[PDB]
Design a protein around this ligand. Structure first.
Ligand SMILES: *[C@@H]1O[C@H](CO)[C@@H](O[C@@H]2O[C@H](CO)[C@@H](O[C@H]3O[C@H](CO)[C@@H](O)[C@H](O)[C@@H]3O)[C@H](O)[C@H]2NC(C)=O)[C@H](O)[C@H]1NC(C)=O
Ligand SMILES: *[C@@H]1O[C@H](CO)[C@@H](O)[C@H](O)[C@H]1NC(C)=O
Ligand SMILES: [Cu+2]
Ligand SMILES: [Cu+2]
Ligand SMILES: [Cu+2]
Length: 535
């Protein structure tokens, strides 16, 4: 059962999968504290036109560096980065680096906005385990439309220790980004706006890396696929099938979740993935030489876990056309032992309860909306504490992928009121988003560490998030804690606020954008030592 497609008919599987280019830093600045190099980047948020339908008009987008997806960052563990996000668009922005324990003022607090004609310098630690992060807009009440129109990109945190694992490698070669979105188009090929949608924006056109229903030519060997659900509201149940046997699911392995590698690969033939979740998959095409393998999406609202509307072609994601032979021998492997996962110390303390539902017309957490400044701070947790949170969806009529900032967490338990599922094998490691499917209650366990500050948690269905399913917690310290905590706990701290710029000095790379000015600014930021407590 599915609904007729609304968007114009598209030429299925005729356009190759695009690969976002790697973003290169402009320069490096010596950290005056420790003498190590900090990589500095400039990203310009700007409108651009993109022809999605070959035979129609074009779509109006707004993206990081004028592309969508934004360019891919590739940063080694231990190297701090500063990214200057320059707003040259027409709406405010707030960048969230999802997956990073950034300080509160560098984390994308929804009120911490940059207006057009201003920029903000974000200072990132890059100390956590190798993982696929992503960076995307988070501006209050306009997050769905900003993300939908193109403000999302990948940020890979790498670790040379994992290179010894000899997994399939090479960005855009055998290590392939798979950014999933679900959108809708007008009869003339422009995007249909999410504005006015207060329930969920499902979309009827499935994209990978910004392209509707692409294909990729692949060799008959192993590939690493980095899946991200960057959709506004659509959740997926991904499986692979030979086009000659479209209903036989082909096995694959999940090797990583939001926060990094699993302890062991999880043998999988169906991957549930909801908004903002990342899973890394290895698929072996070697038994399918000369065949076409279709990446598909489970119907019936993700097999009854979700409520998503299904359309004529939302069961299709993309096609892999497998060559008869490899160019070079495949010498990659998937080891049985991937890593020691750094789970938090377990706690017996009663889980803190959070309920995700509606209060009248508004999506809420414990009956509160983010707009409610006096009531949105729902938890105080001393830094260093391990807490379990019980995340409750009592409803059959919505589902909610919940994101908690700052932390990595372990999924402890899931109970479905429909008896649909419990904890999945690929939820065995550490995560930062967890899907509350229909009538699901999930307990997660997290170390609220190592940095004090006020942070968000929310549903990552961006329609729900905007109206208004988002709250905050404060990871607290005592007054004698030190570490310059006083200037790093408040996300709106004036020191770190956006600053105005003139387009001339930006394009000329002078004034505030001269090497000297950038150097002085970054060296000043570095002296405050924001990430020292992790060292
Ligand atoms: C989130 O938790 C923060 C603690 O981790 C808390 O910051 C603390 O706020 C108190 C009260 O504003 C400050 O206490 C002192 O502040 C000035 C400075 O001397 C004094 O004049 C006051 O009389 C008071 O004694 C703490 O200094 C401050 N701690 C830090 C590390 O900044 C935040 O207020 C909490 N945020 C929210 C939104 O609740
Ligand atoms: C706090 O920041 C100031 C100003 O940048 C710096 O001089 C000082 O060393 C920092 N102290 C700590 C404990 O990080
Ligand atoms: Cu996110
Ligand atoms: Cu939700
Ligand atoms: Cu968030």
């Amino acid at each position: 059962e599915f609904v007729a497609q609304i968007s114009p008919q598209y030429p299925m599987f005729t356009v190759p999968l695009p690969i976002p280019p790697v973003k290169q830093p402009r320069l490096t600045v010596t950290n005056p504290v420790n003498g190590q190099e900090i990589w500095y980047y400039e990203v310009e948020i700007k409108p651009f036109t993109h022809q999605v339908y070959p035979d129609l008009g074009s779509a109006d987008l707004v993206g990081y560096d004028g592309m969508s997806p934004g360019p891919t960052f590739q940063v080694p563990r231990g190297v701090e980065t500063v990214v200057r996000f320059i707003n040259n668009a027409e709406a405010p922005n707030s960048v969230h680096l999802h997956g990073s324990f950034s300080r509160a003022a560098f984390d994308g607090w929804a009120e911490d906005i940059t207006e057009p004609g201003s920029f903000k310098d974000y200072y990132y630690p890059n100390r956590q385990s190798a993982r696929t992060l992503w960076y995307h807009d988070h501006a209050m009440h306009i997050t769905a439309e900003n993300a939908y129109r193109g403000q999302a990109g990948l940020y890979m945190l790498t670790d040379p220790a994992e290179d010894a694992l000899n997994l399939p490698s090479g960005y855009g070669e055998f290590d392939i980004p798979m950014i999933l979105t679900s959108k809708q188009y007008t009869a003339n090929g422009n995007l249909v706006t999410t504005n006015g949608e207060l329930n969920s924006f499902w979309g009827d056109v499935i994209h990978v890396n910004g392209q509707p229903w692409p294909f990729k030519n692949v060799e008959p060997r192993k590939y690493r696929f980095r899946f991200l659900d960057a959709a506004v509201s659509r959740s997926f149940g991904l499986y692979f099938a030979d086009t000659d046997a479209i209903d036989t699911r082909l096995p694959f392995k999940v090797i990583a979740s939001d926060s990094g590698l699993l302890e062991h690969p999880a043998d999988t033939s169906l991957l549930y993935i909801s908004m903002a979740e990342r899973y890394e998959v290895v698929f072996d095409f070697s038994d399918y030489a000369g065949k076409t393998i279709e990446l598909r999406n489970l119907g019936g609202s993700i097999g009854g876990i979700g409520t998503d509307t299904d359309y004529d072609n939302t069961d299709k994601v993309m096609r892999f056309v497998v060559a008869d032979d490899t160019t070079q021998p495949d010498t990659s492997v998937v080891p049985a032992n991937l890593r020691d996962v750094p789970f938090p110390s377990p706690t017996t303390n009663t889980p803190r309860q959070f309920r995700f539902g509606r209060t009248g017309p508004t999506w809420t957490i414990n009956g509160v909306a983010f707009a409610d400044v006096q009531n949105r701070l729902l938890a105080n947790v001393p830094v260093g504490t391990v807490e379990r949170w019980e995340l409750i969806n009592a409803g059959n009529g919505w589902t909610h992928p919940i994101h908690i900032h700052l932390v990595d967490f372990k999924v402890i338990s899931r109970t479905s009121g429909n008896n649909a599922r419990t904890v999945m094998p690929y939820e065995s490691g550490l995560k930062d988003v967890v899907w509350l499917g229909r009538r699901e209650t999930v307990v997660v366990e997290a170390h609220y560490a190592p940095f004090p500050g006020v942070y968000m948690f929310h549903c990552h269905n961006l329609i729900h998030e905007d109206h208004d399913m988002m709250a905050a917690f404060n990871a607290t310290v005592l007054p004698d804690y030190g570490y310059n905590a006083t200037v790093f706990v408040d996300p709106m701290e004036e020191l770190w606020q956006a600053r105005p710029y003139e387009l001339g000095e930006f394009q000329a790379q002078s004034g505030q954008f001269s090497v000297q000015a950038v150097t002085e600014r970054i060296q000043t930021m570095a002296e405050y030592r924001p990430y020292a407590a992790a060292d």
